């Protein structure tokens, strides 16, 4: 995720981590945040400042080893800074001041070479975008030749190290590799590895099954060359440019041992144009050693790829297979109160099997009857559950399931008007959408279901548009006080509805409710969310041309002086 | 279940509440809602217990609300009331005949409990008597016994004869016409008597009116 934000140069939208206030700091266009007062310290818990500090500390471990940096930080905690005067006055500080100048030195002494350069190309003008791949394989020599360039569109561009591994997979995906590539334009020579380094683990007694000689008709035709899978384990954090990539994604889906690769090999299966893998990645649909999220984004492959042509409804039986994930609803849902749902094998993955359906429904508009049939059965499963801890995640990402079911279902748009007389849908779907009005809300200390059941309310009333029904809940729901969650749930949907609404009055009332609501921290939340979603579109008619907002702006500056150090960089962004 | 228990609770809560608007709403609900078939015999059991208790608290309002609730059940086309006819009859009969339904105010309040109870027994007779056989003889014997007992107060008698009168024209002719002259001599007893005063004036007006106006159509 930090890569997404570090692929951004030229006005938007990146910052340094090591922020040294020097006198001659001439480039502050993109650094607005010093590190001077108060709120510029508060704002270095933004995601780049956390998990890119995380990232760099994980690297420096591997260079200065782990046992050594252990002895480092264990001494640092118990290294004592005393004060001692000649009338015997013993002072003790640790639990008492310690310095970062001697931190630098201590790790330097133990382990490592030049750390000034390396850390300089995390904070300043460094890192890469795109790695160019091109391939060859020559029959006569058995030498399989790779040509990896690398490329970085920005002012201040260089050539960079990034350990870039490749593992070639023979006829039956039973190969090996290594590689390194760390110069700008490199051509690297991979020796006569017809037989893998694991020639006889049980790797190639697979092509040595009977596909060494029987399919020597299609190995001695090396036109299907040795299939060079690209970037294991996100080994270098780049955008790859690598023609003909379907086999590479499959081979990483099946035979890779680290699942960091896999979840990215199915993000690439999702997006890059791939021939039929659908039956094969059902292996990794139910590989019961795999993460919640790789089983999820294995469903989301079939979701994204979404038919291509007119075998749309041939995907779908495999989807409704794990639409009943061994769902035994003849004892359920009365003994699934008693169970923990068995997570239903992660409800991240159950969500995105009826949401593979729903994406397919969205993408091609000759689906929608059969999907509706599918997701009608998910609705028959519902309204029979009680409260259970794990089953919050089921309910919460089944309300995203049920949204984008009525959403395609009335995607004959032209306003909402009224949706004419679709009582069958609107009633029943609102019945799940709203809360049980008998059921008191002073009992659950959590609220998930009805946080994302105002979201089931919106987005089924956003794809058409029932304007003033939505905020007329969320205003009431952030006044009454009870339930911290519920309040934020309401306030996040009052700004998701302003994100669509573009009558000026609603934005006025929204910066009034920013001003004084008067929880200070929910005040920030709203202020940032209006600062994220802009009030203009492509057109540029009176851009940022206000007079009273700019007074409010300067009056929200120096409310740092009072407290909230995430309010004044609200102002700082809208300055 | 949570939803069925909640609506049960809410309807019982609305029975005792002085909110006569909210009890009237609970009556409408019990006649109009589908799905109630499991919340039969829990209703009826809690109604019949409440009718015992409130007979021995003289609370006419609670008793009329419980009669109205039994009527709503009996009228609800989504409730198969038959099985529980044999419970609802002796509760409703206890309201018609009861020696301690004191109708002690303004007759309107507790004349209207005996009377309303009798109108529910009259529905139940006219709807189930054919199908059950037991039901007609059980009811007619208990009401005839009351009305014809010299030693049962005006209030018990008037209740039983109102019930008889409204059961059926053919019951009026057969029980109540031949009994008419015998009961006006013996047990004029003015209403079985005091018991009476102006409640043999209004209640033996009503008896002579309902006798004249079921005599006239059983002739016609």
């Amino acid at each position: 995720k930090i890569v997404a934000y570090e692929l951004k140069t030229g006005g938007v939208l990146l910052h340094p981590i090591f922020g040294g206030g020097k006198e001659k700091d001439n480039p502050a266009s993109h650094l607005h945040f010093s590190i001077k007062h108060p709120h510029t310290l508060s704002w270095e818990y933004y995601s780049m400042f956390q998990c890119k500090a995380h990232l760099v500390m994980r690297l420096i471990e591997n260079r200065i080893s782990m046992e050594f940096m252990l002895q480092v930080f264990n001494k640092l905690l118990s290294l004592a800074s005393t004060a001692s005067s000649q009338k015997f006055q013993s002072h003790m500080w640790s639990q008492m001041l310690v310095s970062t100048s001697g931190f630098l030195k201590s790790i330097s002494n133990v382990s490592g070479k030049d750390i000034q350069p390396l850390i300089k190309q995390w904070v300043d003008q460094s890192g890469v975008v795109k790695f160019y791949g091109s391939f060859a394989f020559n029959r006569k020599r058995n030498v399989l030749e790779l040509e990896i360039k690398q490329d970085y569109t920005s002012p201040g561009t260089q050539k960079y190290v990034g350990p870039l591994k490749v593992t070639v997979q023979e006829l039956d995906g039973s190969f090996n590799h290594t590689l390194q590539i760390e110069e700008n334009s490199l051509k690297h020579d991979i020796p006569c590895h017809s037989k893998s380094r694991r020639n006889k683990k049980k790797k190639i007694p697979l092509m040595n099954g009977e596909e060494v000689d029987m399919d020597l008709s299609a190995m001695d035709a090396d036109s299907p060359l040795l299939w060079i899978r690209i970037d294991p384990d996100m080994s270098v954090l780049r955008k790859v440019e690598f023609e003909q990539a379907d086999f590479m994604w499959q081979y990483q889906l099946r035979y890779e041992r680290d699942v960091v690769a896999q979840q990215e090999s199915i993000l690439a299966l999702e997006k890059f144009p791939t021939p039929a893998s659908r039956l094969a990645l059902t292996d990794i649909l139910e590989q019961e050693q795999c993460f919640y999220r790789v089983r999820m984004s294995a469903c989301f492959c079939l979701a994204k790829i979404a038919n291509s042509m007119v075998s749309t409804w041939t995907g779908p039986p495999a989807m409704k297979s794990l639409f009943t994930r061994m769902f035994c609803c003849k004892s359920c849902p009365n003994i699934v109160k008693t169970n923990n749902f068995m997570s239903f094998q992660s409800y991240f993955l159950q969500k995105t099997m009826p949401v593979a359906m729903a994406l397919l429904r969205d993408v091609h508009n000759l689906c929608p009857k059969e999907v509706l049939t599918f997701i009608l059965d998910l609705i028959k499963y519902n309204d029979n559950r009680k409260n259970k801890f794990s089953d919050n995640y089921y309910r919460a990402e089944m309300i995203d399931a049920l949204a984008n079911s009525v959403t395609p279902a009335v995607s004959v748009n032209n306003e909402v008007r009224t949706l004419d007389n679709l009582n069958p849908d609107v009633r029943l779907i609102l019945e799940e959408i709203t809360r049980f009005l008998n059921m008191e809300k002073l009992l659950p200390s959590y609220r998930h279901t009805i946080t994302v059941s105002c979201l089931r309310a919106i987005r089924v009333l956003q794809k058409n548009g029932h304007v003033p029904s939505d905020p007329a809940l969320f205003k009431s729901y952030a006044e009454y006080g009870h339930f911290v969650d519920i309040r934020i749930a309401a306030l996040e949907a009052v700004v998701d509805y302003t994100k669509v609404d573009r009558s000026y009055e609603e934005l006025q009332w929204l910066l009034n409710m920013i001003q004084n609501d008067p929880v200070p921290y929910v005040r920030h939340k709203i202020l940032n969310m209006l600062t994220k979603n802009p009030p203009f579109t492509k057109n540029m008619e009176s851009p940022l041309c206000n007079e009273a907002l700019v007074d409010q702006l300067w009056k929200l500056m120096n409310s740092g002086t009072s407290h909230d150090w995430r309010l004044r960089c609200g102002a700082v962004d809208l300055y | 279940s949570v939803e069925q228990q909640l609506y049960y609770k809410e309807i019982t809560e609305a029975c005792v509440g002085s909110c006569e608007a909210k009890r009237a709403e609970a009556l409408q609900s019990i006649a109009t809602d589908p799905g109630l078939y499991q919340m039969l015999p829990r209703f009826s059991t809690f109604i019949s217990e409440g009718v015992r208790v409130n007979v021995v608290q003289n609370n006419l309002a609670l008793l009329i609300y419980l009669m109205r609730m039994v009527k709503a059940l009996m009228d609800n086309p989504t409730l198969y009331l038959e099985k529980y006819v044999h419970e609802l009859i002796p509760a409703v009969m206890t309201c018609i005949v009861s020696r301690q339904l004191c109708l002690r105010p303004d007759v309107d309040n507790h004349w209207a409990l005996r009377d309303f109870a009798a109108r529910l027994v009259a529905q139940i007779c006219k709807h189930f008597s054919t199908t059950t056989n037991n039901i007609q003889s059980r009811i007619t014997k208990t009401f005839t016994k009351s009305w014809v007992d010299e030693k049962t107060p005006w209030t018990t008698r008037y209740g039983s004869i109102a019930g008889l009168a409204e059961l059926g024209h053919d019951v009026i002719k057969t029980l109540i016409l031949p009994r008419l002259q015998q009961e006006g001599e013996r047990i004029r007893s003015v209403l079985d008597g005091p018991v009476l005063s102006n409640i043999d004036r209004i209640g033996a007006d009503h008896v002579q009116s309902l006798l004249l106006k079921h005599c006239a159509p059983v002739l016609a």
Binding site: C329, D383, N384, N438 | S1, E3, E25, D33, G35
Partner: peptide, 26 residues
């Protein structure tokens, strides 16, 4: 009153669903 009616309807629906489930099991 309206709210109460809605609640009742919901309860009825739930009951129906339960019945259906039972039938399926049978």
């Amino acid at each position: 009153y309206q709210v109460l009616r809605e609640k009742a309807a919901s309860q009825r629906r739930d009951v129906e669903r339960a019945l259906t489930r039972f039938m399926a099991k049978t």
